Subunit: 191 residues, 2 copies
């Protein structure tokens, strides 16, 4: 099976192609952050919208949400969202899904296929929001480092986030708890 | 709350201090790999040992299993396992747990405390094994890159892994599925 190799190979997939970064980011670091953000958003959403989400499936979906970029590489959204490329890249992403996991036990094989082809719309939407939050946070850290080239990136991500908070109250709550002073200049928790 | 800041601050915590690495590894990359390994080990263990594990708690424990290293930094095991430092570092790790998460909702606060102070012994043991597997895998990748300085590291980690496979059949199965040709020289799945 290639599955363990793929998990480590995600470190070789860079994000933010074409932008100067003070800190280079790979898909594994991004996915770690998306898992944690997805968990936090889930807890907030459960309490506000009065429900219980299946966190096993949510966390596993977040964990593997970008695993196909080991084949496609990471195509930045200004490129992937172009009308010329939008549908073909989703079709390509779908082709990678249907091919990735071959030499496994049916316990793993079925469970891996279930995760990749997940049709739980709410879990997909939570991870999509977590994905946007993480992109915003990265842009905040770069700006904080002094990277003027991410100012316009932070602004458009922040504008899209603001609009999402008007429609998803759990995102507004997340914004209020964490995204108003981010990152922290004083990491008091270290001392 | 410092929780979101801490999630990103784990990128500033390096592993393998005092060893030459061709690729520098941080706690976020390591934790991503441990989450995925913990999931795979859990599926194998469930099938072999005839049970169902609560994967929500397992994955969340793996996710945060090294979060206290944002305060302690990452102390390598030859140092932390010295008889002089063994108990004090665990006491220190415990002090960090009881202090980390302050300004949260009780939904988050209680859930975060539950995860950190988890007393499910089996979940702790799965993550401990995943942690050893990840260390072995890192050592395999470095050796594969040509890093002769990790040969003796790979050997001792491999020896400890071999002994663990004699006592935990799900680890032997994992070894048979993934750890016999690792990493792959031919990443055929990319093409
Ligand atoms: N303004 C931007 N300029 C350049 N790259 C960007 C920008 N915004 C995002 N990226 C990169 O595309 C990746 C994912 O972005 P996203 O998740 O926020 O957008 P969607 O794919 O969800 O539409 C992100 C890092 O490479
Ligand atoms: N032989 C070694 N030489 C130097 N550093 C090591 C070695 N083995 C492990 N490390 C580093 O200690 C970290 C964790 O190791 P571990 O998880 O396998 O050992 P335990 O803490 O579980 O006893 C690891 C990377 O920094
Ligand atoms: Mg996105
Ligand atoms: Mg993503
Ligand atoms: Mg360990
Ligand atoms: Mg660890």
């Amino acid at each position: 099976s290639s599955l363990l190799d793929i998990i480590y190979q995600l470190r070789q997939v860079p994000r933010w192609d074409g932008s100067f970064q003070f800190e280079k980011e790979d898909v594994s670091q991004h996915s770690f952050s998306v898992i944690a953000i997805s968990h936090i958003l889930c807890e907030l959403k459960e309490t506000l919208e009065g429900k219980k989400i299946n966190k096993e499936k949510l966390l596993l979906y977040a964990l593997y949400h970008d695993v196909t970029e080991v084949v496609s590489t990471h195509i930045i959204s200004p490129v992937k969202k172009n009308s010329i490329l939008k549908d073909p890249f989703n079709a390509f992403r779908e082709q990678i899904k249907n091919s990735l996991f071959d030499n496994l036990p049916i316990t793993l094989s079925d469970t891996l296929s279930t995760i990749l082809n997940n049709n739980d719309l709410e879990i997909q939407e939570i991870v999509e929001h977590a994905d946007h939050v993480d992109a915003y946070c990265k842009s905040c850290i770069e700006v904080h480092r002094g990277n003027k080239d991410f100012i316009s990136i932070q602004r458009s991500l922040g504008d899209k986030l603001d609009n999402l908070t008007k429609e998803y109250p759990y995102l507004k709550e997340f914004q209020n708890l964490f995204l108003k002073d981010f990152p922290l200049e004083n990491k008091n928790y270290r001392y």
